[PDB]
Amino acid sequence: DTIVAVELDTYPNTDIGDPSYPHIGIDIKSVRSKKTAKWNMQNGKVGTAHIIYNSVGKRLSAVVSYPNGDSATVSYDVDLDNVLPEWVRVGLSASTGLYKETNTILSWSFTSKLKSNSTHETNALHFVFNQFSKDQKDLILQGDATTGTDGNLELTRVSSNGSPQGSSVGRALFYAPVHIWESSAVVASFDATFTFLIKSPDSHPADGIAFFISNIDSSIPSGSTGRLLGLFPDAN
Amino acid sequence: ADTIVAVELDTYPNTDIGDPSYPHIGIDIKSVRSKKTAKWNMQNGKVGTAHIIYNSVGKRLSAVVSYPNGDSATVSYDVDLDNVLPEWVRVGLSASTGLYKETNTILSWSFTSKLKSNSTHETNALHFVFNQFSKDQKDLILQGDATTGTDGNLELTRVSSNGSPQGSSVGRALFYAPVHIWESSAVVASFDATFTFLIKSPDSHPADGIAFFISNIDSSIPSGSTGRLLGLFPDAN
Amino acid sequence: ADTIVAVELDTYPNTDIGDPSYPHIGIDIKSVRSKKTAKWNMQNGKVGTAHIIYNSVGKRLSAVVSYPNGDSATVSYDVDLDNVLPEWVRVGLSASTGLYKETNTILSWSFTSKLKSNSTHETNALHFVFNQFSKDQKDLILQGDATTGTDGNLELTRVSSNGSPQGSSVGRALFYAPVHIWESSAVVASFDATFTFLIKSPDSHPADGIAFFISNIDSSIPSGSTGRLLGLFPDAN
Amino acid sequence: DTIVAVELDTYPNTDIGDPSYPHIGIDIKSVRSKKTAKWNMQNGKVGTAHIIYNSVGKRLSAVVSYPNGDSATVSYDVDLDNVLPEWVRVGLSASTGLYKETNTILSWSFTSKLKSNSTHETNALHFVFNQFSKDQKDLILQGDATTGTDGNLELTRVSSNGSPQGSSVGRALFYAPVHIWESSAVVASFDATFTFLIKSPDSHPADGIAFFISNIDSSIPSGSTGRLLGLFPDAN
Ligand SMILES: CO[C@H]1O[C@H](CO)[C@@H](O)[C@H](O)[C@@H]1O
Ligand SMILES: CO[C@H]1O[C@H](CO)[C@@H](O)[C@H](O)[C@@H]1O
Ligand SMILES: CO[C@H]1O[C@H](CO)[C@@H](O)[C@H](O)[C@@H]1O
Ligand SMILES: CO[C@H]1O[C@H](CO)[C@@H](O)[C@H](O)[C@@H]1O
Ligand SMILES: [Ca+2]
Ligand SMILES: [Ca+2]
Ligand SMILES: [Ca+2]
Ligand SMILES: [Ca+2]
Ligand SMILES: [Mn+2]
Numbered sequence: 001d002t003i004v005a006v007e008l009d010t011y012p013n014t015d016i017g018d019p020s021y022p023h024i025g026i027d028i029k030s031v032r033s034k035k036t037a038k039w040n041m042q043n044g045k046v047g048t049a050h051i052i053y054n055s056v057g058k059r060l061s062a063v064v065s066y067p068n069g070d071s072a073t074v075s076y077d078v079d080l081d082n083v084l085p086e087w088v089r090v091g092l093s094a095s096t097g098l099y100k101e102t103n104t105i106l107s108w109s110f111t112s113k114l115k116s117n118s119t120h121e122t123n124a125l126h127f128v129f130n131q132f133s134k135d136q137k138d139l140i141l142q143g144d145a146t147t148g149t150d151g152n153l154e155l156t157r158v159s160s161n162g163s164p165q166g167s168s169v170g171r172a173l174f175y176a177p178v179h180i181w182e183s184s185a186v187v188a189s190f191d192a193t194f195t196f197l198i199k200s201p202d203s204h205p206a207d208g209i210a211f212f213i214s215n216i217d218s219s220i221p222s223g224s225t226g227r228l229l230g231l232f233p234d235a236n
Numbered sequence: 237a238d239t240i241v242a243v244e245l246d247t248y249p250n251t252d253i254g255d256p257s258y259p260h261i262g263i264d265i266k267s268v269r270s271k272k273t274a275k276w277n278m279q280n281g282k283v284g285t286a287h288i289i290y291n292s293v294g295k296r297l298s299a300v301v302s303y304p305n306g307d308s309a310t311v312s313y314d315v316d317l318d319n320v321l322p323e324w325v326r327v328g329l330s331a332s333t334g335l336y337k338e339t340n341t342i343l344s345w346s347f348t349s350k351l352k353s354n355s356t357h358e359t360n361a362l363h364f365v366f367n368q369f370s371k372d373q374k375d376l377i378l379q380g381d382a383t384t385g386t387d388g389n390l391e392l393t394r395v396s397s398n399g400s401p402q403g404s405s406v407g408r409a410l411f412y413a414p415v416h417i418w419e420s421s422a423v424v425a426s427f428d429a430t431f432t433f434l435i436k437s438p439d440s441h442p443a444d445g446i447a448f449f450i451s452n453i454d455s456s457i458p459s460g461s462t463g464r465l466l467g468l469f470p471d472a473n
Numbered sequence: 474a475d476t477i478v479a480v481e482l483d484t485y486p487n488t489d490i491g492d493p494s495y496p497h498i499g500i501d502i503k504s505v506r507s508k509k510t511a512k513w514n515m516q517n518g519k520v521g522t523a524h525i526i527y528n529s530v531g532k533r534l535s536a537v538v539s540y541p542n543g544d545s546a547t548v549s550y551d552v553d554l555d556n557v558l559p560e561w562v563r564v565g566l567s568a569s570t571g572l573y574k575e576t577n578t579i580l581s582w583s584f585t586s587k588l589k590s591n592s593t594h595e596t597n598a599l600h601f602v603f604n605q606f607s608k609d610q611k612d613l614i615l616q617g618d619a620t621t622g623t624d625g626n627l628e629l630t631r632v633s634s635n636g637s638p639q640g641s642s643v644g645r646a647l648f649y650a651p652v653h654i655w656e657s658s659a660v661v662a663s664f665d666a667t668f669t670f671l672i673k674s675p676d677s678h679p680a681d682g683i684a685f686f687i688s689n690i691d692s693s694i695p696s697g698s699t700g701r702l703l704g705l706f707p708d709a710n
Numbered sequence: 711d712t713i714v715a716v717e718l719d720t721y722p723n724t725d726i727g728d729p730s731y732p733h734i735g736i737d738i739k740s741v742r743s744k745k746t747a748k749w750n751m752q753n754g755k756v757g758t759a760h761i762i763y764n765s766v767g768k769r770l771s772a773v774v775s776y777p778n779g780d781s782a783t784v785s786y787d788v789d790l791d792n793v794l795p796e797w798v799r800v801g802l803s804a805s806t807g808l809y810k811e812t813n814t815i816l817s818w819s820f821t822s823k824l825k826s827n828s829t830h831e832t833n834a835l836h837f838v839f840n841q842f843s844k845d846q847k848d849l850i851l852q853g854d855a856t857t858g859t860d861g862n863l864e865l866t867r868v869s870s871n872g873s874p875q876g877s878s879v880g881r882a883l884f885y886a887p888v889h890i891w892e893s894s895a896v897v898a899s900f901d902a903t904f905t906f907l908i909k910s911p912d913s914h915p916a917d918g919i920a921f922f923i924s925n926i927d928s929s930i931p932s933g934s935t936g937r938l939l940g941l942f943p944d945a946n
């Protein structure tokens with residue numbers, strides 16, 4: 001797997017290079033973020049994350065914020081054209097370990113826009129989910145991810161009473177592959193937004209939610225529970 | 237059987253199954269026998285453009301086909317697309333040839349679906365645009381004879397090495413991801429589609445046409461859908 | 474005189490000028506006397522949402538009004554908007570009070586205009602979204618009593634210091650830039666609009682309503698357009 | 711005036727800091743670009759320019775390309791939130807001096823998208839012109855700019871026969887002011903595209919076309935003909 005992700009790291013794993021507080025981070029082929037920023041996760045409130053990148057500027061940026069709480073931002077110079085293949089799948093991942101939290105997605109949108117050296121926009125791909133059904137046929141649900149419960153996407157397993165389980169991992173990839181770079185495109189850009197609700201019975205809720213982009217055939221790596229966020233096969 | 241709604245660009249008049257006696261555009265609602273047609277000039281060798289548009293409040297599906305070097309034809313039909321279509325569909329382009337033939341080349345195709353809720357937000361939306369097609373076009377499901385050739389184009393029907401089209405061919409391209417055409421909380425559901433195309437033939441009676449269509453998610457080319465059936469329908473009912 | 478097309482959210486029944494005997498929504502084509510209405514429940518103190526939608530091929534203007542804590546009303550009318558409207562227009566929100574009153578508060582407003590040509594491209598497009606309004610809202614033309622208050626909202630009609638609405642008020646907000654509603658090369662012309670709003674009143678008979686409207690570029694509040702005339706019309710013809 | 715512009719500098723003025731070849735440049739309050747790149751202008755062919763920026767990454771980027779010719783790119787790190795006022799007008803400018811060229815705009819689009827710390831997009835402004843009429847009521851035409859001739863925007867004066875005049879300057883601003891930064895926006899982004907046709911009877915056609923963003927009340931500065939591009943009152 002080839003993975004680029006923006007993580008909402010709610011649990012600090014200092015032994016695998018995480019900062020010692022909850023943080024947001026940009027991950028380029030490693031759980032050890034290339035850049036992080038402190039982030040004050042807020043139990044039981046709706047937050048929003050935004051991701052943005054264009055192929056000329058070559059800087060991947062993210063922002064996470066609470067209306068009535070904290071906010072954080074992070075940016076990293078990388079060219080995704082040398083990282084990511086031409087065809088990718090876009091997705092959301094989340095996990096728990098010993099500690100947990102609901103990893104509840106209320107909404108998710110993604111917008112890829114490819115402008116050509118002509119008048120026309122060569123390619124484009126845009127979706128919005130503000131609600132999720134029990135049979136969400138345009139999402140590939142991996143692991144413990146389920147849709148529909150309360151018109152929501154629950155990436156990690158939640159029991160009937162509404163309490164989260166540990167040792168869970170799950171993801172939701174958009175059904176169609178995304179032509180992230182196409183020939184004849186002069187400018188390739190994308191942005192993403194998701195709104196989420198992290199609830200928990202733990203003092204260090206865990207482990208986080210991530211927006212990712214990967215090879216089309218990406219799947220949950222073996223043992224990627226907990227600190228690995230359902231994203232990486234190891235902590236290198 | 238498959239459930240089909242489609243706008244047809246019908247190059248060949250099959251009067252014996254209810255086509256008008258000239259090339260036309262039509263709105264097909266579960267039958268190749270159009271509910272509504274309009275006279276249409278297919279300009280051999282020219283790039284044309286079709287636009288489709290509908291909303292769930294108005295319940296009136298409409299299409300326009302134009303050539304930048306010719307004229308325009310339009311057709312509109314009253315129909316409640318949720319009373320025909322299932323909740324989840326796929327969207328596609330189909331085309332066919334029979335005893336008479338033509339290239340059914342797609343230069344570009346876009347589709348925009350928006351469902352609006354009780355609030356400001358969209359419960360749901362999908363939009364794609366294609367302005368070229370490569371060899372391995374991973375976001376399209378190609379059926380029958382369709383290929384994504386290297387002129388950067390999508391060829392729906394079989395074209396030989398020299399570039400001349402073959403008879404008795406059928407091909408389609410479905411967008412990869414299912415489309416959520418109905419959402420229970422959705423108050424206003426709309427979509428529009430556009431495709432540019434080049435129909436070229438050495439024939440003075442080119443056949444058979446191209447169609448934008450919406451179908452059940454598992455739709456596939458019916459057996460015996462060549463020629464006048466446009467790769468859409470298993471018969472002329 | 475001004476040329477007006479508007480969807481009205483009419484909170485007060487003026488039976489004596491052809492309103493139904495209940496609150497309603499209506500499509501007004503050059504006259505306050507709606508061509509089509511539907512029964513409508515205005516939920517005092519609640520945020521509602523209106524959606525408007527039309528295209529030039531279908532020629533059927535449609536609207537939906539919903540409360541997330543109530544129900545929905547819809548109205549549709551066949552009308553060719555180029556046979557009513559000039560080439561260039563402005564788009565706006567209007568509201569009024571008369572002897573009876575209500576707050577006519579706008580929380581959000583969007584408008585999307587797209588005109589499609591002979592080719593893949595849009596000859597022309599305009600889209601705006603407002604999800605809040607400041608004190609100096611430079612992309613809106615405010616008329617009469619309208620203010621862009623500091624609750625981040627647009628107040629169309631006069632509200633006193635304590636927050637209770639006044640009678641005998643009229644206000645409007647027009648988007649700054651003219652809209653090119655007709656283009657000669659344009660084959661498909663569509664638009665959709667959405668606004669969220671809060672009508673609040675201490676009255677058990679609140680009045681008068683809010684309207685999304687389209688008008689000549691130089692339109693202004695007609696004299697005597699308070700109350701049942703919704704800031705739109707100079708009389709009840 | 712406060713001016714941020716991306717220029718398509720077809721004529722080199724080495725005495726005011728231009729490179730010694732035609733170039734594209736990013737201008738931040740000065741005709742002396744903060745960054746330039748060589749650009750092989752191509753007489754009598756349709757080209758396309760793209761501009762892009764977001765307020766998190768804080769990098770303004772541009773690309774100019776010909777289908778059957780040359781292409782160029784330039785990027786500059788700047789925060790436009792400390793440069794540009796909250797309200798702006800967006801526009802196109804072009805000029806001639808002793809030397810000229812048709813400064814013909816075939817199409818122009820702009821897209822401002824403001825995402826909030828909620829689900830919603832706080833504000834947005836998007837327009838597309840692929841054709842231009844003799845009474846283009848949503849453009850403020852300044853100086854010699856005219857619309858309609860051949861469904862086009864001619865920013866600089868062109869005689870009846872179709873040959874360009876020298877000592878001309880003109881611009882077209884979009885009628886509505888643009889709330890480029892609004893409060894409660896978490897991410898502010900914009901992009902712009904214009905396609906153009908530069909034709910000339912000169913070996914060093916002149917002087918260039920620019921996409922700009924300015925204070926709402928911006929107007930052609932006195933003597934901004936020629937090398938100043940209708941943008942700046944002087945060459946500082
Ligand atoms: C003992 O730690 C476990 O739980 C934490 C937090 O849940 C994870 O980060 C880690 O990988 C383990 O699964
Ligand atoms: C003459 O009839 C045949 O050819 C026409 C035109 O190709 C088809 O429509 C039809 O199905 C038959 O195959
Ligand atoms: C009772 O009539 C008055 O009040 C109603 C409701 O406000 C208005 O519609 C009308 O124009 C008059 O001013
Ligand atoms: C003599 O130079 C003149 O013409 C060139 C190119 O047209 C301009 O750059 C310059 O400002 C002058 O107007
Ligand atoms: Ca961690
Ligand atoms: Ca036929
Ligand atoms: Ca009334
Ligand atoms: Ca110069
Ligand atoms: Mn981390």
Ligand SMILES: [Mn+2]
Pocket residue numbers: 244246255256260262268270
């Ligand atoms: Mn037919």
Ligand SMILES: [Mn+2]
Pocket residue numbers: 481483492493497499505507
């Ligand atoms: Mn009424």
Ligand SMILES: [Mn+2]
Pocket residue numbers: 717719728729735741743
């Ligand atoms: Mn320069």
